[PDB]
Amino acid sequence: NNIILNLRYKDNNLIDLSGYGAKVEVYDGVELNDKNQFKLTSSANSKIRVTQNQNIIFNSVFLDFSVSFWIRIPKYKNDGIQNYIHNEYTIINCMKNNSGWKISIRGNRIIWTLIDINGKTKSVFFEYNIREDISEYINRWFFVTITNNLNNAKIYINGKLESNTDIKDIREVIANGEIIFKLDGDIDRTQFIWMKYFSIFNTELSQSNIEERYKIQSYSEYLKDFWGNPLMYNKEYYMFNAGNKNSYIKLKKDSPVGEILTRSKYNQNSKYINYRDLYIGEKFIIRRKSNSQSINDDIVRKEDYIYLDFFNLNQEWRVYTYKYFKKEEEKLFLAPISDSDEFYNTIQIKEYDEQPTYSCQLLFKKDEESTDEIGLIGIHRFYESGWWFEEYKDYFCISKWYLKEVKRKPYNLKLGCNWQFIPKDEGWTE
């Protein structure tokens, strides 16, 4: 409600479904999908022009409005950190007679600029850290909302207030110009931005309305990968533990188990950046257990029954749990595909969290029918060796312990039963 522009995918196109029937021109250089995602590149013809309807009556000038959208901003090039930090570029422009708003990016900053008839210019921005071992923001879908009052220009991220500027010094802003979606500034030939669900409202939205909107635009039947795109069957993925962020799974040498190693890090000499490597450890692949069920698309849904496979020695291997583990946690068995009575191979994929998340849980069961729970896949510190000094070592494991900890509310984000799946993505190079 109060919505005055609402860009949505429809028949190989973007259209205003606000109910005010704006004209939208998508040029040949914009990539679209039925997931409502669209891509702006460096190309001259990667642009969208939106003309607001001029046969219906709207405000000539206005300073009580809001802009909502999701964005996915690719990681800096390691050898391009100078240009990234310094070179500001517009992504969305709405200016008639040298006044109105624009959205722009300078490296790890997203910037909201107002300009009045007089030419007074005020900005509010949101900067994310590019020294984090694992960023919540770099190359990942997140939710932006910018509200405007007479007093305050606010930026909310994933439903939470983050930045505030005083804009009482600005009285008059023209908000009825053409909205041009286009990368405009000294960008690299390879620069691009993904956006979805771009909306404009004729009101300043409450924090409550922004958080309800974050939760609804986040909800799906289907699970999501590390980047925030839909999780897929038959797709190569690396595995991230949300509970042990700097951990990764590797097949132990001459042993059919998964040892947990520490992620390698950014090794070059830039003082401005640091990250943990993401494209390390075993390459996993998700398979549907059943083909007799209806499987029109390759999208992984909550409560689906899967096999969890990985590649070893140019062969597809599988993750099993031993059937008879008396202990509270056991090392998983990583071995070729095999009908063996001594091991379970069936996983149900769960979402125990009720807040928006990209994490999922992996529940071993007897059969698709059996109603009893064996344990959740996680990580555990096991006794390795020593009598005087005791060596302990992390292994890829199952645990009954997790079954009780997933029931506690608010959901414990720190549990090692919380996994994300990371495919190779052009927006992350290391």
């Binding site: 001459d254 042993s255 059919p256 188990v257 090392k331 068995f333 071995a335 095999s338 063996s340």
Partner: peptide, 16 residues
């Protein structure tokens, strides 16, 4: 073959 049987044996060695 029983290459899988040699891994099941190594797995049993691994978890005590």
């Amino acid at each position: 073959e029983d290459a899988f049987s040699k891994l099941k044996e190594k797995f049993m060695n691994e978890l005590h």
